[PDB]
Amino acid sequence: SAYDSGKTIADVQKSATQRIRISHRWYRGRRYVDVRLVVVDRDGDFVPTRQGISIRPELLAQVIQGLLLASREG
Amino acid sequence: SAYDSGKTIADVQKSATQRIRISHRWYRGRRYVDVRLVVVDRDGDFVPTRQGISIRPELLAQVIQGLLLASREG
């Protein structure tokens, strides 16, 4: 399980046992926006998995724009 | 190639060796949006990794809104 550092910005619920967690992480002088699958524990809280990406802030707009475009498929 | 699978919507360059690929695909009549770290083999032979997420399109608005928030705050 990934090291659970960083500030949760938003938790998007996938199911009773999974969420997509969007968080800020600071590491070695540098901030990242982390987007990661997290899974439920025995106490109703969630634990981060390795299935996630870490995005430097200057790439966020492009990731947003790509998702906006992906929303038009259907 | 990581670009074989479904439709590439966007290809966000991280470095010469890594990109974040946002793709859309269908299987058995269900839609999948994928956001995934892809890494060089050689050439444009980028290859996918497990560092990604796979979501249903009904979660897109929430993910987008979370990333917009992450861009503006903290």
Ligand SMILES: [Cl-]
């Ligand atoms: Cl939690």
Ligand SMILES: [Cl-]
């Ligand atoms: Cl994992």
Ligand SMILES: [Cl-]
């Ligand atoms: Cl980056």
Ligand SMILES: [Cl-]
């Ligand atoms: Cl892009």
Ligand SMILES: [Cl-]
């Ligand atoms: Cl669908």
Ligand SMILES: [Cl-]
């Ligand atoms: Cl999903």
